[PDB]
Amino acid sequence: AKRIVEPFRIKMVEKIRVPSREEREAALKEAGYNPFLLPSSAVYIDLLTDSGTNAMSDHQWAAMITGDEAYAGSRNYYDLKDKAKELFNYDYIIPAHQGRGAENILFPVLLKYKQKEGKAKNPVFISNFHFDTTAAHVELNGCKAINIVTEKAFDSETYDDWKGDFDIKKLKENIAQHGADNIVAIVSTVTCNSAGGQPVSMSNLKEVYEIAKQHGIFVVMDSARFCENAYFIKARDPKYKNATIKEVIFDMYKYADALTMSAKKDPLLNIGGLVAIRDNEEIFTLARQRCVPMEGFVTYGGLAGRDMAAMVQGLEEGTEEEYLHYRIGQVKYLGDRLREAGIPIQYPTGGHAVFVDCKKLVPQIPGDQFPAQAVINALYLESGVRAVEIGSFLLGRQKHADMEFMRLTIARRVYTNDHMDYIADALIGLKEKFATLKGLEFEYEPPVLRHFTARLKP
Template sequence: MVAYKSRTVERIRLPSRERRERALEGAGYNVFNIDAEEVFVDLLTDSGTGAMSDRQWAALMRGDESYAGSRSFTELESAVEEVMGFSRVIPTHQGRGAENVLYGALLSEGDVALNNTHFDTTRAHVANQGADAVDCPDETARDLDADEPFKGNFSLERGWEVVEDVGADRVPLVILTITNNSAAGQPVSVENTRRVAEFADEIDATFVIDACRFAENAHFVREREPEFEGRSVAEIAREQLGYADAVVMSGKKDALANAGGFVATADPDLVERCKARAILYEGFPTYGGMSGRDVAAMAVGLREAVEPGYVEDRVESVRTLAALLEEAGVPIVTPPGGHAVYLDAESFYPEIPPAEFPGQALVCELYREGGVRGVELGSFAFPDADRPELVRLAVPRRTYHREHFEHVAETARAALERREEASGLRLVTDPEMPEIRHFTAELEPVSDSTSIRTEGRR
């Protein structure tokens, strides 16, 4: 059932193939460098790219721009406590600002941070503190076709292996990302969350939930975890988040806003440490680098995210795209997650080795064929991690319709039919920080004479 009707529309146009070719070459074969007006269907990210509701737009008009103690902050504080159960909130300009504030307060040189799977900015913030980021994905996460309900879970077995190897005193931080973005957006069960909380408590570590997509995760729990059958998304979300000592949040995801983020906790000592960093890097702790109007819109969106009907519509739109891609014969990760469809680039281009970035090659071909922009989450984005070669097609909230998804599926089908013409890529520029190189690095196609492909590579 469609939950929304449109009040404002934006005209979009598909640039000619010649224009797309020029744009791709000019961008150094990195679609982050392509102007948005050159993109037809933009699935680069679901972060801050969705359509806000009429209630959020009304909140923008009422935003209180006071530097300290604004009404908008009070509204956010109330929404966070109501929806997530945390009484203390430090707003930030977006999720990575919240990561900087929280992880900067918790990590020191030589520490180890555990996560079911670190995303790019999370890994970079850990590294920026001189700490090591270690992934502890569930064993089912590597099986892209496995029909398992919670492939995003944290592996306690792997967590204990790390603790036994480095010592509990070097592991002050355990993070659980819900849903698990880097593991194809797969959900995490409440039972796994409980066990991770117990694990963190046993090693005396702070347990943080990266709650960017907490409402989508709660929807999957309601569908797949028998204990929670018949429970509301709002009830499930509060219980799952309640096992954490703190949450880090990008308001540009499941707070349905175009800007913003926050750290939330019930720990008075931790909140004071975070406030000090927030003042240095974000602004006064009641505005956090945001305008009051954006704070107000985020407060409204946080409540809307757990309202009946919203998440069902959200997840169904992603499933629609997944079904169309499967009908087109495109290899995808199954079951699809809540915010994106992940393409299996290794199956798409079996002859392109990881050193030639098959996922980035696929990203380029999707743009070349149909002006569709996605993002690579494989050997290009994560050079030092053992990750599958994936391309994420992230669906902005309440933005695109079936006709757009049909175009994406047809574009992917065309790329698949011309897969023999695709070339691997090599780096031309390599930024200093490898954890975030995929945002700015430039590449070029690998010619036949310089290809490092080997017969029987796969």
């Protein structure tokens, strides 16, 4: 494995502590064996998400301090509008309080727009892979969320350059099956979070957009990790090995009509989101009319002015190639420590997380005994590291658990490679009691979203 040095130095620290196993195990009892219900006081290193836990720069805090809190016409709204025009070449912006706020703004509008003239009677969204909140909004609006990720993503340990690509064959089949008139939009998720943070190639984005444009289908770029996608295109696509990251981004967004962004990811923020529309004024007007009751007035969108100011700065810092190389290299370093030790991962590692594959380390625990969770709980009891499950405890009602992933999600510019080593050694050291591991059962199961609030028991 290769350690890559920080292209920065530390200016402010935040204390963290590992609770004693007596404290650590008592906290898991009261938590009901669900890490989502643990308080942060009980977590050493927190790998639950890369969302909103990033470390900002001094320039970002300086922007927050001079942020314009005006209810209408904030200086930072116009800055954010100019920045989206610079990065994506899109003429219209609506800030949102975070990613799913942006989805709430835009997806109901696209459905209403598609259902003009009385079409879209069987409305669907098609994505390489809809993220959970994205799919939830698709379905809350009475549509179907169709995921057509490339089959390469399903062969975890076999390298491929672009495991986030659309299955182009399935895109055409679905357009034929449902009809272009029922397809509300195509959602291109970059990077493809649910496939393991795996990149979508520039030629896949291009071909998907050209196919959709030919059928008059609107394309939204789910852009939470668009900079981590742009880096992979520069690193794996020869046509772009000599291009700046901003050049890769500018081309990427020729292949979408709008974007929804969680700025809690690649823009390096702790809160914030964005809608941006290339040139459809009518959809922009309609989305603004939804923004007002759901989020806020159209020039802050549920954000403080200081957070729009931090977004303007964080959008620039997140395109910097030397940071991205360090960021994605640190993720790759953790993955290499793991697979050099014989732990299966989605290879290659994505931009933001290491995905530990199905539990070939706990064979005695089946699907509905939650094998990834028992790993996570022993991993938590042995080290204090909170990870998130992507398996039979997330999927729910039992829909076939094709993968028993464990996601080690890494916040940006927060943890060092020595933190990565601690993570790796903890998980490797679980090859002592991996076999002698008890399964878990529902002591309290909620009707929906159980992985958030279900109380389990060994």
